[PDB]
Symmetry: C2
Subunit: 119 residues, 2 copies
């Protein structure tokens, strides 16, 4: 099945790359929780942090390691790189290995670690 | 299917926790490559590094996040914590999110990132 991978890719394209914070509630369950590099973030803080960042001059590109996907009912894991650009600064690339679990076609949990750590 | 998860758990129990480096060739394909925190390590360096470390006074415990597994044909992803103890030192816990791809019931690729970074 390609559903979970297609959903994850669509979220990255239409929410992240497009910096469209209004789509967070379309892609994420209201009870969503993110685990990332030692932090546990509930929906409210995830959403507000992205609303703030997406209002800045930042831009994002994404690359997927096409050899690293794992797909199962309502779940996906993969390896991605997010490249961030800011005005007058050199782009930076961060590697993210993440697991996403879905409920009713919205993301309910993500567990991820990054290299380098964003902290 | 439970095959890939069972294999990964057996490798962690019988190779890592037991510090049995002689089992590396039983669990890993001769063409295995590890991607970890920005490093790409082929079989030779992976094996030799583990033969050396396992000869030291170190010990390992493992915890699996039982809510984070993703399983597919010949592939698994999960979230684990490795706790390392050394004589006269406090134990340290590292979080690892990893994806393992299998060929013929041996691990052929791992892609992982850790928190904190072991580097």
């Amino acid at each position: 099945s390609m559903v979970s991978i297609a959903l994850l890719r669509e979220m990255f394209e239409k929410m992240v790359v497009a910096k469209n914070a209004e789509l967070i509630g379309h892609y994420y369950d209201p009870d969503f929780v993110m685990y990332s590099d030692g932090l546990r973030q509930e929906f409210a803080e995830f959403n507000e942090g992205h609303r703030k960042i997406y209002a800045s001059a930042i831009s994002y590109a994404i690359e997927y390691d096409e050899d690293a996907w794992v797909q199962a009912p309502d779940r996906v894991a993969g390896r991605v790189w997010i490249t961030t650009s800011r005005p007058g600064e050199k782009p930076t690339r961060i590697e993210v290995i993440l697991i996403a679990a879905y409920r009713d076609c919205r993301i309910h949990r993500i567990w991820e670690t990054t290299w380098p750590s964003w902290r």
